[PDB]
Design a protein around this ligand. Structure first.
Ligand code: WGX
Length: 110
């Protein structure tokens, strides 16, 4: 274990708690959304983030936070504004920003 990776684990749990519908917990289902990859270059979701974390693919906070931001921005891009998904991504961006601000202040003074 390392202190940084433990912090990322805690931070990832805190971000997922904000996704009360669990709609970002797993990859957007390509079987239901067959054109998703037409529009979205790099899909992201909380399970893939956890897999990245446990595989040591986040050694710095920026790479981790950019993947969180990708969950949000992919959703805003794909979905019309008047959808449950778009509205949920906006709320996740707002509620997650505070989580990431406090967590980044911990990794920097590490
Ligand atoms: C295309 N899409 C996104 O762009 C996106 O950001 N998310 C986060 C999505 C997330 C899901 N779920 C959400 C449930 C958990 C499994 C993954 C799906 N599955 S779904 O069968 O199309 C579906 C599912 C539920 C509802 C609708 C579509 C339409 C509105 C009514 C509710 C597509 C998503």
């Amino acid at each position: 274990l390392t202190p940084f990776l433990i912090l990322l684990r805690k931070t990832l749990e805190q971000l997922q708690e904000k996704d009360t519908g669990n709609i970002f917990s797993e990859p957007v289902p390509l079987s239901e959304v067959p054109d998703y990859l037409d529009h979205i270059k790099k899909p992201m979701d909380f399970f893939t983030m956890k897999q990245n974390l446990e595989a040591y693919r986040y050694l710095n906070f920026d790479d981790f936070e950019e993947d969180f931001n990708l969950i949000v921005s992919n959703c805003l891009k794909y979905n019309a504004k008047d959808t449950i998904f778009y509205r949920a991504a906006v709320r996740l961006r707002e509620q997650g920003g505070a989580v990431l601000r406090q967590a980044r202040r911990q990794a920097e003074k590490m």
